[PDB]
Each structure stands twice: as C-alpha cells, then as structure tokens.
Design an enzyme around this catalytic site. Structure first.
Site: not given
Ligand SMILES: Nc1nc2c(ncn2[C@@H]2O[C@H](COP(=O)(O)OP(=O)(O)OP(=O)(O)O)[C@@H](O)[C@H]2O)c(=O)[nH]1
Ligand SMILES: [Mg+2]
Ligand SMILES: Nc1nc2c(ncn2[C@@H]2O[C@H](COP(=O)(O)OP(=O)(O)OP(=O)(O)O)[C@@H](O)[C@H]2O)c(=O)[nH]1
Ligand SMILES: Nc1nc2c(ncn2[C@@H]2O[C@H](COP(=O)(O)OP(=O)(O)O)[C@@H](O)[C@H]2O)c(=O)[nH]1
Ligand SMILES: Nc1nc2c(ncn2[C@@H]2O[C@H](COP(=O)(O)OP(=O)(O)O)[C@@H](O)[C@H]2O)c(=O)[nH]1
Ligand SMILES: [Mg+2]
Lengths: 45, 50, 426, 32, 437, 49, 426, 427
Positions: E10, E205, E253
């Site tokens: 995500q 974050n 590098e």
């Molecule tokens: N920097 C940043 N971190 C994000 C963002 N959205 C989610 N996260 C981080 O992603 C972490 C969780 O993983 P996600 O990417 O949200 O979800 P996923 O990896 O797709 O895993 P699933 O939800 O099970 O499909 C959370 O702890 C958030 O801190 C974002 O828009 N920017």
């Molecule tokens: Mg996800």
C-alpha cells in the site's frame, strides 16, 4: 466527492526540460543508419 | 552564479503568490462545509418541531 | 471484487437490516425504486460489494431474509426501501418458533435450513470472489438465534476460508425481553465460540443510554437504535466500498484484533453522537472525535472498560483528516491511560482512514474494542443460567423436543473456561 | 477522561427520565 | 544507463505515485505521456531515458511496476490523472489482500502472483539495454509489503543476483504505530532482507513527521507531504545518472563506498535544506550550513540518535550551484569537529558528489526552490540500536505466543520464528562487533 | 501529544508539540564538556617556514 | 497558550459569572450570538485564554456552571449572553442543599462531584497549557461553599502544579442572609487554607457602602455589585489578555504577594469609581487614581487597613500611562504613610501596566493588597462560631448527617492558629 | 568583523526593539529589510535586497515576543531567531534556572552556534537582560554558563539593568539579583550596570519630559550602545574595538563592573540656544546629574575611564580637556593606576530618530568608567536582601522548585567576599 490522492495530484500547470541534460553525442554522430558509400559532395570541406 | 540566484528568487516569488491563493480557497471550502452542516441542523430542528 | 452477503434472522435482525439497507442505499445514492440517482462516480465503482446490477441500472441488494412469521416480512415491505429486495430471497417458514431454541435449532430448522442453504448457495456462486458473510440476529429470540446458529454451523462447515460477521445483541437483567434469555444466550454463544470468526456484541440498554445522554432524544423508538447499529455496520464496511489513505479489510481487522482463537467478542461504538441542541457549540477535530471515542459512556455494550483491560482496539476514521493527528491522538490515549491497556502487547491500536465521510457529517469514526471487561457480561448471564439450571425450571420444553441435559453441561462448562481464560489474560 | 461510578442504569428510573425530560424542555424553550 | 522501479504494498505505490509525478515534472513530460517538443524538433536529450523509454513516436512510458493485491488503490491509480502515462499492463492488482499476514502474503497468494510479476519484469529487462540495477519500494509492516515483497526479492536474486538491489524500506516507528503485528512482520521481512538486498535504506515515519513539523512548519501533515519529500530524496539520489554533473557517481558506487561488509548494509538517509518559501528570504544559503544540516538528527529520516553511535562511512550528494572548493572546506570542518565521531578503523569516511541541476518544485508542494541541496546517506550503529529496540517488542509478544495461530493456520511454524530471532541476535552481535575499535 | 507539558518537545516547533526530542549535533547539551568553537588546525607546513 | 478555565458555584457564583462573562465578551467584542464583530485585531490574539472556537466563528466560553436548583439555570439562560454557554457544561443536580455544608460536602457532593470532575477534566486537557483555574462562589450558602470546597480539594489532589483563583464573598453580621453563616464559613476557610492557592476576600457590605457614598446610587441591585466584582476579575486577568509595557501573570502576582504559604487571603479595590454627576468635574492623572485607590473606603472588604499593616500590595493599571509617574506615585505613598506597611520587607508594592483600558474608560486600576487587617474579619466570624458551638445550636443537622465534632474543633484550631500567626506577623 | 547580540527577558527585547530600530536608520535600512560593507558587523546579507540582523530574542512568555512578530519589524527579523517558551518564569530564579532553562537553553545554544558558524570574524557576544526579573536572571545565568564552556576566550558584553534602590516594581528582586550576580561574577567578561532611577532623573531634568515611558529610556540606551559600537561600524581617527575594554578596564579578574554615562543629553530647543564644544561636555560627562546609575562617584575613586567620541572631534581639545580633568582635584583616581584614560574618536555623528526627543548634535561623548561606588551599591542591595532572608520570606517558592539553603548562603557570602575585594582594592 474528492479523494485525498486525487486532490493532492493535479496536472502540472507548465513543464520545461532541465537546463543540463546529458546529451548523446556518441550515438548521434558516430553511428549512421544505412549507407556504405556517400555522395562525393555532401558537406563543404 | 548571480543569474541562477535571481531566477530562483523569481520562482520563489511566483510560488508564494500561488500558496496564498491556495490558503484562500481552502478556507472558502471549509466555510462552505460549515454552512452545509448548519443547514442540516436547521432541517433536523424542523423535523423535531413537526 | 470483494463480496459480502447479508443474512437477517429473527425479528430484530430483520428490522435492523431494514434500516441498514436504507442507510447503505442512501450512501450509494439509489432510490427506493431501485434506480441510481447519486452524482459521484465513486459510488458506482464499489456497489458490486452489496448489489447485483439489474436491467435498467437497478441494484438489488445481496441479502437473504429468514424468519418464521409473515408479519416480519410485512413490516419489511411496508417501509420504504422495501420494494427493492428479491422476492425469491424471502425464504420463509409458516409456523413460528416462539422463543424456543430447540424449535429454532432442531424442529423447524430441519425443513427450512435446506432451503436457506440453497438460496445462500445460489447467492454465493452468483459472485466471483467472496470476502465474508454478514448475519444480523439476536441471542434471546427463537427464530433468530437458534436458526441463525445452525445456519452459521452449516455455512462454516461449507466455506471454512471466508470471514464471518455476526451483529448480535445480548440480553441484560435490566432489559429483560423474554424469560429464557440465558437458556438461549448460553447455547448460542456456546456454538458461536467455535463457528463464528468474530462477533460484535450489542445490547439494548447501552443504546438507550446513548440516545438519552449524548443524543438527548425524548422518545427513543426502535427506529433510532436500529439506526445506530446500521451506522456502526456501515462504518465497519466503509473501507471496502471507498478508497482511503490506509485501507483495512475484514480479514485485516480480524488478524489485528484477534490474538487468540477464542477471544473474538468485540464491543463497538460510533462517533460523533452529539445532541442537536449542542451541535452548534462543539468542534470537529480528531481530538474532538477521539475524546468521544474513548468515552466509557459510548461503548454500545454495558461493559465498563474501566473495570477491565483492553487487549486491543481499532479506529476507523472517515473524512479528510491529517494522518499525523490520528497517530499522535492514539499515541496519547495509550500513553495517558497506560494501566488499562495490556502490557505484553505493545501498540494496542490499529487505525485506518477512509476519504469518504457519511452523508450529513464531516468526520466520523467507528471504534471496535476487544477488551477483557466483557467477562463481567458473560458471568452476568451465566449466573442466571446456573440459577435456573439449579432447579431445572423451564427445562422440559427443551428436554422433550430432542435436546438433553449434557448439552447444557457442555455449554456452561464452555462458558466457564471462557471467563476463566479472560480472567487469566487480565 | 472521566473518572466516575458506572452510570448506565441511572436512566432506568422513571423519576430520573422525567427529570431529564424537564431539563430538555427547558433547554429547547430557552433556545427558541 | 537504466534502472527499473518496483512498488510493492500500500505504501510503496503511493510513494511511487509521488515519484513519477515528480519525474514527469523534471523531464517536462505532460501527464498524457509526451513532451511538448518532439524529438527531432527539439534538441536531443537523453536524460529522460534512464527512467522511462520513448515508445514509437511521441509517447514515453515509465520503467516501473506497481503491484498489489487489493484492487482499490491500484484502480484509483488507473482512474487518476496519470491514466495515459503509466503502462496499462504494468499496473498489477490481485483479488484480496494479504491483510497484514506475512505468511498469507508469502505462501498463499504469492505462489500465484509472483510468477506473473517476474514475467513482466523479465520482458522489462529485455526491453532495457544497459540496466544498472533494481530499486524497490515497500513498508515492512504490511502484509503485501513484507511477504510477497521478500518472495519477489528472493526470486530476483536467484534470477540475476549480480545486479544491485536498492531497497527503500519503511520501518515502523518506536512509539507511533498503526498496525499491531508489525514487529512480527518486520522480523520476518528482515530475515530475508539481510541476505538478499545489497543496499537497504531505512525510512521511518516519525522522523519525517517531526521534519515537516519543525522545518516545514505544517501543523497537520498527511501521507501526501511525506511521500512528496521521499520522492524528492529519490530524485536527488538518481540525478547523478540523469543529469551530467561535475563529479558523478552511479548505482554501483554505493555498493563499494558505503557497504564494508557482506551483511552490514543499512543506511540512514537525510535531506537538506528542507525549508518553506516564507523563511527562504531570511535564510542565507551556502554549503557549510547545509552540510551541517545534513548531519543533524533534526533532519534525519529515521528516529534515532546518531550521536550515540559512531559513523562508518557517509555519502554526500549535492545538487545545484556547488563548486568542489567549498564542499571540500565544509567536509574538512566536519572531519575536524568532535561532537560526531567516525569509527577509528576507517580513516576516509566520505564519498562526495556534485550535480549541476538544482532540485525542482511541484505545484501545491510545500518545499521552496533553493540553490542547492544535500542528500546524506550514512552508515552507523544507531541502526543496530534500532534493531535491538525492535527485537525487544518482538520477544515481548512472542513470549505469550500471541497472534501465532494465524501464521500456523496459514502453514508456517515456530521454527522460522525462532531462527529469525536468533538471526537478529547475531545481527546485533555484528553491529556491536563492528563498532568495536 | 504534549498537551500540558513545559518540555522541550512541546517548545520544539514554537510552542507546538513534537513527537520526541532530538539531540543536537553542534553542542552536547547535558554534558559539562562542550564543543570548542574555535579549534587550532595545523596548516600546510609549506605555509610557515 | 496560557489557559484559565472558569467555574461557578452556587447562585451567587452563577450570577457573578453571568456578569463576568458579559464583561469579558464586551471586551473581546463578541456579540451575544457568539460571533466576532470587533474592530481591533488585538482582541483575536488572546481569546483562547477564555474561549474555544466551535464552528465558523462561534466562540464558546471555557466555563462550567454548578448548582443544585434549576431556578438559577433559568436565570442565567434568561439574560443576554446566557445562550453562549455549551449546554454540556450546565452540569447540575436536581435536589438541592439548602445552606447545609454537610449536604454540600458529604451527601450530594459524592453524587455530583463525580460528574463535575469529569467535565472539568475534559475541559482541562482540551486546551494546551493550563495557567490556572478560576472558581467563583460564596461562603454563606451550602451549594456554593461545600460543593466548591470538595471540588477544590479534588482539583488540587489531581493537578497540583497549576495556579488557582477563588473569589469568595464572606458573611458579615450587618448583611447576614442565612443563620448558619459561621458554621459554613469556618469549615470552608478551614479547607481553603490548605487547598486553594489564593483567595480574594469580598463582602456585600463594603460593596453597599461603596455604591452609597462614591457611586451615590439610589437602587443598588445585585446587578451593579456583580458588575463591580466583574470589573475586578477582568482587571486581574487583563495581563494575560492584552500586552503591556510591564506584564505580570497569575503566578507572577502570586509569588509577589504570598510570602508565606498560609498567608493567601487578599482584599480588593477598584478605581475610578466616580458618580456620573461628578464625572465632568474630575481629572485623569495617576495621583487622581492613587488617592481613590489607597483610600480605606475603597477596599472591597469590611476590614479597615489602617487598623493593621500591609504585608504586600499590588496594582495593575490599564491605559497609556507614564511608568515614571506610576512608580514615583507608589514610592511617595510608601514614603509618607510608612507606618502602615511592614518593616522587614522593602518595597512592598508590585506594579504592572497594560496598554489596553477597559471599554468605556481612558485609564483604570486594580488594587490587590495582602494586609493583616483580615484577621479582624476572621475573629468576627470565629467568635460567632464559638458562640453557637458553646450551646451546640443547629449542630445536629450536621451531626446526624455524617459529620462529627472533631472536624469542628479542627476548624476552630486552624482558624485560631491562622489569626495567631497573622497577629504574630502584624 | 562581526558581533552578535542576544536579548533575554521582558526588558531585553524592548531594548532590542529600540536598538535595531536605531541601527536600521543608521545604515539607511527600511523596515522591510533592504537599502533603497559597514553593516556587515550586525547584519548578514541574505542573497540580494535583504539583511537579517545577527540577533536572537528569547523569552518565556509569548505575548511580548509575538508583539514583535506582528509589529512593524515583521519583515526585518528572522522568524526562527525570535524564540518564545510557553509559560513565564514568573519572577522566580529557581524556575527560570532549573525548571524551564533545562528545556529552552539547548535550543538557544544550537541557534547561537549556527549563527556563529555563519559569522567569520566574531569579535564577541553582547547580552541584554535585567537581573530583577525571573526569566532574564535564571536562564541568563544558565545561558552564560553554557556560552563560557563553549567559547571561553571570546568577549561577552553584558549590559544588565540592575534594580534601583528606592524606585522599584518587584518584590523578590533582591533574591534574583543576588542569585544572578553569583554567576555573572565569574562568567561575564565585561558587565555594565544600568539602573532606572538615574535615567528617570536625566529625562526629567535634561530632557525636561515630565511624563516619560519606557520607550524614551530604551531610546537613550540604544544611543549609548550605538555610540559604543560605532568604532566597529565606522572608521574614525582612532578606533577601539570590543577587545579593548576587556584589557583596558578590568584590573582584576573578578572586578569587571562598569558605570556608564552619556552627554550631551540635550532637548530640541535648548541645544539651538546653547553652544556645543568639547570642554563642557567632558565636564558634563562626570557629574552625577548625567550618569546612568544612581550613585555618588564623589564618594568613590575611579579605577579607569573610557571615552568614546562621535562627530566633529579633533584630538587637540580632547587632550586639553582630559588634561584639565587630570589637574582638577574635584575627582580623584586610584593611586595604583596613574594613567587612567582610554579614549577613542569616530567621525560619524549620532543620528536622530523620528519619535525621539533628541536633536542632532555636532559631537557627543559616551563615558564608561570603573570605581568603588558600585561596591557601595552591591552592599546596599545585599543589606535589603538579608533583611528579607533573615525571616525566611519567600523561600518556600524556591525550595518548592527544587533549590535549597546552600546556594542562598553561598551567594550571600560571595557578595560578602566581593565587598571585601572592593574595599581592599580601593584602599
Ligand atoms: N510513508 C508512508 N507510509 C505509509 C503510507 N501508507 C501506509 N504506510 C505505512 O505502511 C505500513 C503498513 O503497510 P501498508 O503498505 O500500509 O499495507 P500493505 O503493505 O499493503 O499490507 P496489507 O495492508 O496487508 O496489504 C503502515 O505502518 C504505514 O506506516 C504512506 O502513504 N506513506
Ligand atoms: Mg496493504
Ligand atoms: N529599562 C527598562 N527596564 C525594564 C523595562 N521593562 C522591564 N524592565 C525591568 O525589568 C525588571 C523585571 O524583569 P522583566 O523584564 O519585567 O521580566 P523578566 O526579566 O522577563 O522576568 P519575568 O517577569 O519573570 O518574566 C524590572 O525591574 C524592570 O525594571 C523597560 O522597558 N526598560
Ligand atoms: N435493536 C432492536 N432490537 C430488537 C427489536 N425488537 C426486538 N429486539 C431485540 O430482540 C431480542 C429478542 O429477539 P426476538 O425478536 O424475540 O428474536 P426472534 O423471536 O427469534 O425473532 C430482544 O432482546 C430485543 O431487545 C428492534 O426493533 N430493534
Ligand atoms: N454579590 C452577590 N452576592 C449574593 C447574591 N446572592 C446571594 N449572595 C450572597 O451569597 C450568600 C448566600 O449564598 P447562597 O446564595 O445561599 O449560595 P448557594 O445556596 O450555594 O447558591 C449571602 O450572604 C449573599 O450575600 C448576588 O446576586 N450577588
Ligand atoms: Mg518578564
């Protein structure tokens, strides 16, 4: 209805190429598509 | 050097002008939302009266 | 893509579902004639989760009604948003259960559950990729609890890989609708602890206290209570239907909230619930919503969170909010009241943000807390159960139908080990 | 946030209910 | 010189949604996918090639694959403003999420999605000619971001291996959290990220929240601004390949100058000057102040105390109006300071680089346009401190066997939990051993 | 966060509450020993002779 | 930023705060509907010290009412600027105390202190930096004294680091409303001496003689007296709300006025208080202000300061005034009447200037003098307490309710040692 | 050559609001920040068309600092440099030194160092505070301690506002003064006392203003500081930088306490009637009717005197006047210092400010001396400190903060030791 991702990114108002971009002089001048022999006079020398 | 600086400063000026209008539109939209919510409150009061 | 089917059992489940489908139909913009009349195309993209496209841009709900007395069906079709169901889905007996669990689980089930299993089958393979099942019922009624429980049994035997939502009200001594409430509640939960994956425990008196203190309604009929429960259900499922900055599906909520296979009875709550006279005097911020969220007087179950510990909790926000405010708000609530949260599980809060607020509000939140305080509710019903079992009152209407005494012994034993392990983890 | 005796059975009493109804009447009339 | 970008989870694909917007803005690409001046008509430019390739005539497509299992965010992309720019086939969406379950992402749905993913990458590489390496975007907390991300990394390692793999991973903040099982997910992901990835960069974050809060003085920041800043830092990283500079470095590098050991590859990143337009006029911008800003933890991207640990080796990418003289002087001042300590056994601890093109600005962004910018990518022992902190909260929940039944119901066991635990133990041993003089 | 807190974390962004304090490179606050602002640096030998 | 929450107890506290909030609202230019309409942009900059923006320019006072009889609620909602309060803050019992301190502290307290502590806690952490709390009540009633007393105790044991103001009118035999006045007063002060941080002693008798002589008023209703006390309260909190050439916040005045922990009972004066007939023949100079300030007939208590000694004094001035004239006037009044001050503390005058006057005046002033003449009023009440306690009259209505005798003896001891050390330092 | 200026306390930033106002009109800089090399000592030129002052206001209450933020000089000062805590020290040395200093001084030091890093030829720092208040004393001591361990060798000019004996506005200020001097003794290099009664008398008599406010006081003090730093800002017949007062006026490492004065303080009309020369203003700069600290120098003996001159000044008459002063017996120097003068001349005349009550003068004199009358002042203060402390008044506040009796006793005996040093050196 307005989504945060949709609201955050809009088409950039205007765009221009960077002042310093790597230019491929090598590919541009060294390689020439298809001609084994060229007309005697094409460039003044 | 000085030319690059001057051009960057001009771009800064344009950017600040943009940000001010951004703030204006944001506050206007918030105002509109609050107006909508108060209209809904009025309607609910009318329902209760009925 | 993802799919939720809806099953309504008993009178309470039917009327709640009626209000629920009115709410969803409003949020998606379809008229009670069955035609789309919304404006945003964000609605169209994810109505396949709840509806079947029909000729003429009409979306019938993916729902199944189940009961034994036609008056419930009349009450469903009388009200608006009633003409949109499919009459083939009105699977329906003729005699009536009459608040007898054995009648809902052995006598009339034996001839009606085949038909509802067939129609829930047809409605399952009508879609492509199931997400879960969503059943609304009670725990004291006859045609709702017993038939719904046996239905959950057959479906879990059939599809063991899909999620399961049971919105089930529980009885209390102060709100005592029928007399055999423990006799029905005990057996139903005694089956739900192995079948259902997660259960949202509800009660009437906490809803009553909500509409009176926070809403300050004068005549709180069933329509408003069922309106609240519908609001919670729409909130818990808003993540699939609308895009968000941090999405949390049904299984995602499940694995974040269930640390042990038997510890899956959640209390729920909804914000903002604010009296119309004072709606003008309040603010709309994440701290404003959160202080109302973690209020002990806003749980929709009569289980005092101050009298137990939280194992875990979740918060589903709706609207354009700053995620930082969300994170630091939840971090505060955990830092300030650190004694009530469980210690051997760090970061007891799951949070999610969807971009679409419900119609009529600007920001909303659905709270789901899996605390250990509900053992007080289970002992509260188990005590009545043991008290009645000590002299076998009202038992023979259950004995003479096919149920025997060891079923009761197993139920109370399972209740006992459940409250014992709740006590253990507290 | 609110450290109290649990009070979700405070409005099962008809007297309390009518009290609070009086309060609501007063608020609404003064608001008008 | 080309490099391809894959976005898993995500978070990674939203970061990429910021990155590619930034890149089209840097190369003058309209969102429909073509330059305003065509190739023959305008002066020949090859800067854009490293990111996307001109297809046929007057149409450019990015060397990226977004992939995830929920369809929601990805078809949000498909219907966003970048419909014509991204390749329709490259965006890949599954049917149902991993749902924060490393096992569910690595064994259940991976077995069917990763073959398709590796298929497209293969023909992407075949279309590519001078591939430098890979760069991957993911957060280790989620399910899709950890499980099938690591599985894909493993399979890329067995496919190519010899190429560098830049992984920009988001670790979970200590105090701030949004999931619950993310210690489990982070441990199970780092077990494979240790022995597959070549160069792994940590992006927390919390530190970015504090950055946009203090320096950018925005009171209510969302993920949008965070991902904007991360796009800025990635662009600053790749600008050496994209634009000709005075002193350039490539992807290989960081492989040599930054990683002294086969397993010690965990880099704290930082960026400076992160400054709003209003305060720009008051501030006077030279190289010395930003060289200090690049080292202060008030401008690092991971919530940790660099002063507590000792540095190993640092890299200083400069963009904009920068001559070698003053940066040599500034690095001399840094080396002669004593509030920060380099490791004894390493005498030369710097890898500088200068590029002529200054950073760009995006409409609606909060960063102002400045003369020059610094991206510092360092190596220290505060990262080992972070790993110890994570292992703590891991074993706390592991002692009571919480949440293990989901994993063992997917099909995993306790053995990999135990061996990843002892692996991270040995890894902490490694960091302290290296710190030793 | 730092609702009612007179700490540096609350003051850090100008009376708005920061998630957590950061140590400062330029000087070591807590310790009595502090960074010498001007440190004599040996110049090239060629310069003096 | 810095925050003062407001608390009103009893009928007198309710009406006082009614006029007080009307005054503050007038100063900040907010209409009775709650919207800003002022002219100076200085008013916007310090309204968070007393308000909260609700929605779209709707500011609600950060106040909490607390009483036991709904007639007071009717009265406060009757008048203008009575609709701006948040109805959630109208926290309120139903039965009533009836000038019974035991009822205000033992029976209805434990049923109402519950909820008021809850709304004040919510209101406290709503804002960021608490400067202190403000409570306005009486010492004759039971709903004011006993309730506020227990409220102050609970507040002090919860938040000990923040400042605390309590404005209490004391009973005198000349204006003696109820009969149990010493029975109430002695126990209340017995609690304020260890709990409250400082108390501003007021009395109706001094207010009466002031509006008789100086104001030459014909009809001194309660509105005008409360209007005077409101002008006092606004004068003391003006430093927070407006910038001045020399500022002195709440804690600054407290540390400047309190040399010993138990010496925190002050008396007040206000000037200019000039009749409207003579308001044309007057001058506007700092000696014109200082003569009316330091006159013994302008103190708002029934304690002649020339019968004792000043320990410390403070004067908050408002308006564009020359600071040199200010300090030389203070120096002259310290030089000439040098016997009336204490000796072993040099420069017993603390002074502060704010550049914004009260609305309707060009230059105003507020005097807070901690003298030792207050022990006369404490003897004035403790002798009546001993007179009633010698015969145990009216005692059983407190004894049979739960209170015992040693509490009365402890109040006697604490009063006696209080006036003993006042006499010692005199 | 550059020197930076920090302001601490509710009085310090008011002085600064007058000082920097004076500097901008001296260098022709509008409030927006740009002109329509000599400025280099106080402002750094941020790119083009903008100058930021090398300054940092610091305070714990926010109301006065954001008055500066929203005043007329919003476009001049750097947003970060104005630094405001959340709540005030409230006239409590213990609170301003242990409760809030622990949180604010770390931010102050990391700001001042990156300011020193921006500077190149730093001469020193100069601090503005008043020792009567709570903020300016406590964290001022804490700040000065941490500056001394950081730099040590560089000059730190402290222009303190001490509490006048008979005119005063605080109560606990004897405690604040004693607790401040205990650290100002061994941390400040060069410290200038400034009472308020003396400036009141000057403006009442010379400026004949019957109703003065703090604005006029600050305008006069800014004039003194500008006349003191004009040697760095402009070239003259004889330049004297910051490091000179370090060695020219401090005979012993613990006696660094200077008395200031200024002349001619002349109104708009009397100056036009009167004739200005150098002999009379050299005389005028020595009477107690034109000093900046209420004391009697005739009861004291001068240690060393320093004299800045601005305007149309030649060395001839200044040598003649200082001769007449050396031959007169109305004033006596110390026996151990035969040559007790350090003079300096600068060409640029003192400018005028709109809203100020001074007219343009051809020449002016700023005197900074050192004597034993200050030793009488510290005794006068310590008497009324011990008068309150003997009954343990107000001690419960400080010990409730976390301090004890120990530093009270040791600061009392430190001023006693300081008193013995003055009577010894004056002997
Ligand atoms: N920097 C940043 N971190 C994000 C963002 N959205 C989610 N996260 C981080 O992603 C972490 C969780 O993983 P996600 O990417 O949200 O979800 P996923 O990896 O797709 O895993 P699933 O939800 O099970 O499909 C959370 O702890 C958030 O801190 C974002 O828009 N920017
Ligand atoms: Mg996800
Ligand atoms: N010369 C001059 N002195 C001032 C001015 N304002 C305040 N003072 C002096 O400052 C002393 C008290 O300190 P303040 O500046 O008022 O406040 P502070 O130093 O910040 O200490 P706090 O009151 O705790 O905040 C008083 O004795 C005044 O003499 C001013 O404008 N000009
Ligand atoms: N929310 C809600 N609950 C109801 C309603 N009607 C009944 N109930 C609850 O349903 C429970 C009894 O279930 P019942 O209706 O008898 O189920 P059935 O007889 O099997 O259909 C009682 O505890 C009621 O509190 C209703 O209209 N709304
Ligand atoms: N200033 C003022 N004082 C009042 C008012 N009403 C009552 N009091 C004083 O309050 C005292 C009695 O307090 P009471 O009203 O019984 O307090 P309660 O019963 O707790 O609400 C008397 O001595 C009166 O002097 C009023 O309207 N204004
Ligand atoms: Mg101050």
């Amino acid at each position: 209805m307005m989504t945060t991702t949709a609201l955050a990114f809009q088409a950039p108002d205007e765009h221009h190429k960077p002042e310093h971009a790597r230019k491929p002089l090598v590919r541009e001048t060294f390689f020439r598509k298809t001609n084994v022999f060229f007309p005697e006079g094409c460039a003044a020398d | 050097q000085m030319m690059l600086y001057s051009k960057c400063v001009t771009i800064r000026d344009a950017q600040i002008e943009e940000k001010k209008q951004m703030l204006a539109e944001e506050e206007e939209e918030q105002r509109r939302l609050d107006l909508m919510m108060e209209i809904e409150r009025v309607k609910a009061l009318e329902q209760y009266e009925a | 893509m993802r799919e939720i089917v809806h099953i309504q059992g008993g009178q309470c489940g039917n009327q709640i579902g009626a209000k629920f489908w009115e709410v969803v139909s409003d949020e998606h913009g379809i008229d009670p004639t069955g035609t789309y009349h919304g404006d945003s195309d964000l609605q169209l993209e994810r109505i396949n989760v709840y509806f079947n496209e029909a000729t003429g841009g009409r979306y019938v709900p993916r729902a199944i009604l189940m009961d034994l007395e036609p008056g419930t069906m009349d009450s469903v079709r009388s009200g608006p948003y009633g003409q949109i169901f499919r009459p083939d889905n009105f699977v329906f007996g003729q005699t009536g259960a009459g608040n007898n669990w054995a009648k809902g689980h052995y006598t009339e089930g034996a001839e009606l559950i085949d038909s509802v299993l067939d129609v829930v089958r047809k409605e399952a393979e009508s879609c492509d990729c199931l997400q879960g099942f969503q059943v609304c019922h009670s725990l004291g009624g006859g045609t709702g609890s017993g038939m719904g429980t046996l239905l959950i049994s057959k479906i879990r035997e059939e599809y063991p890989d899909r999620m399961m939502l049971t919105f089930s009200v529980v009885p209390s001594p102060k709100v005592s609708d029928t007399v055999v409430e423990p006799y029905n509640a005990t057996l139903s939960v005694h089956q739900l602890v192995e079948n259902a994956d997660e259960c949202m425990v509800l009660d009437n008196e906490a809803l009553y206290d909500i509409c009176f203190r926070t809403l300050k309604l004068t005549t709180p009929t069933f329509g408003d209570l069922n309106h609240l429960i519908s609001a919670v259900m729409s909130g818990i499922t808003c993540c699939l239907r609308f895009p968000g900055q941090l999405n949390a599906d049904l299984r995602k909520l499940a694995v974040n909230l269930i640390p042990f296979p038997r510890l899956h009875f959640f209390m729920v709550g909804f914000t903002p619930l604010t009296s119309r006279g004072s709606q003008q005097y309040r603010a709309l911020t994440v701290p404003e919503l959160t202080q109302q969220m973690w209020d002990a007087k806003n749980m929709m179950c009569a289980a005092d969170p101050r009298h137990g510990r939280y194992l875990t909790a979740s918060a589903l926000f709706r609207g354009r909010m700053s995620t930082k405010e969300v994170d630091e708000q939840m971090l505060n609530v955990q830092n300030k009241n650190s004694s009530y949260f469980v210690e051997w599980i760090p970061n007891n809060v799951k949070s999610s943000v969807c971009d679409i607020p419900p119609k009529g509000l600007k920001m909303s939140a659905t709270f789901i807390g899996n605390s250990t305080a509900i053992q007080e509710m289970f002992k509260r019903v188990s005590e009545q159960f043991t008290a009645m079992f000590r002299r076998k009152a009202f038992l023979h209407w259950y004995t003479g139908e096919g149920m025997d005494e060891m079923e009761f012994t197993e139920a109370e034993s399972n209740m006992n080990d459940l409250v014992s392990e709740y006590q253990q983890y507290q | 946030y609110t450290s109290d005796f649990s009070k979700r059975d405070e409005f099962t009493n008809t007297i309390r209910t009518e009290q609070w109804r009086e309060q609501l009447k007063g608020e609404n009339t003064h608001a008008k | 010189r080309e490099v391809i970008s894959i976005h898993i989870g995500q978070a990674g694909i939203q970061v990429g949604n910021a990155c590619w917007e930034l890149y089209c803005l840097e190369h003058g690409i309209q969102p429909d996918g073509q330059m305003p001046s065509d190739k023959t008509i305008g002066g020949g430019d090859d800067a854009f090639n490293t990111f996307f390739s001109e297809t046929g005539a007057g149409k450019h497509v990015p060397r990226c694959i977004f992939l995830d299992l929920e369809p929601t965010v990805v078809d949000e992309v498909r219907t966003g403003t970048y419909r014509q720019l991204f390749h329709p086939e490259q965006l890949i969406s599954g049917k149902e999420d991993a749902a924060n379950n490393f096992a569910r992402g690595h064994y259940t749905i991976g077995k069917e999605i990763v073959d398709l993913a590796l298929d497209r990458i293969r023909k992407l590489a075949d279309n590519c000619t001078g591939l430098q390496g890979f760069l991957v975007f993911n957060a280790v907390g989620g399910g899709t971001g950890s499980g099938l991300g690591s599985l894909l990394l493993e399979r890329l390692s067995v496919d190519y291996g010899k190429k560098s793999k830049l992984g920009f991973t988001v670790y979970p903040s200590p105090q701030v959290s949004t999931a619950v099982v993310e210690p489990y997910n982070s441990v199970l992901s780092t077990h494979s990220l240790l022995e597959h990835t070549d160069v792994a960069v940590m992006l927390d974050n919390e530190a970015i929240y504090d950055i946009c809060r203090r320096s950018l003085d925005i009171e209510r920041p969302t993920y949008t601004n965070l991902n904007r800043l991360i796009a800025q830092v990635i662009s600053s990283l790749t600008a050496s390949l994209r634009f000709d500079g005075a002193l350039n470095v490539d992807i290989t590098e960081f492989q040599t100058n930054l990683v002294p050991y086969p397993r010690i590859h965990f880099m704290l990143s930082s960026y400076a000057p992160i400054i709003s337009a209003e305060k720009a006029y008051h501030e006077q911008l030279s190289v010395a102040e930003i060289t200090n800003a690049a080292f202060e933890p008030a401008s690092m991207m991971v919530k940790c105390d660099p002063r507590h640990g000792k540095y190993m080796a640092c890299c200083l990418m400069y963009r904009g109006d920068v001559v070698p003289k003053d940066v040599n002087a500034s690095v001399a001042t840094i080396k002669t300071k004593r509030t920060i300590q380099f490791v004894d056994w390493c005498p030369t601890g710097f890898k500088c680089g200068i590029n002529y093109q200054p950073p760009t600005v995006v409409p609606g962004g909060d960063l102002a346009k400045v003369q020059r910018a610094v991206c510092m990518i360092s190596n220290s022992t505060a990262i080992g401190e972070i790993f110890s902190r994570l292992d703590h909260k891991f074993d706390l929940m592991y002692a009571k066997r919480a949440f293990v039944h989901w994993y063992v119901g997917e099909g995993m066991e306790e053995g990999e939990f135990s061996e990843a635990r002892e692996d991270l133990a040995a890894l902490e041993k490694d960091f302290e051993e290296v710190g030793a003089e | 966060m730092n609702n009612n807190k007179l700490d540096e974390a609350a003051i850090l962004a100008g009376c708005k509450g920061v998630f957590s304090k950061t140590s400062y490179i330029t000087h070591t606050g807590q310790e009595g020993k502090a960074e010498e602002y001007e440190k004599k640096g040996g110049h090239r030998s060629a310069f003096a002779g």
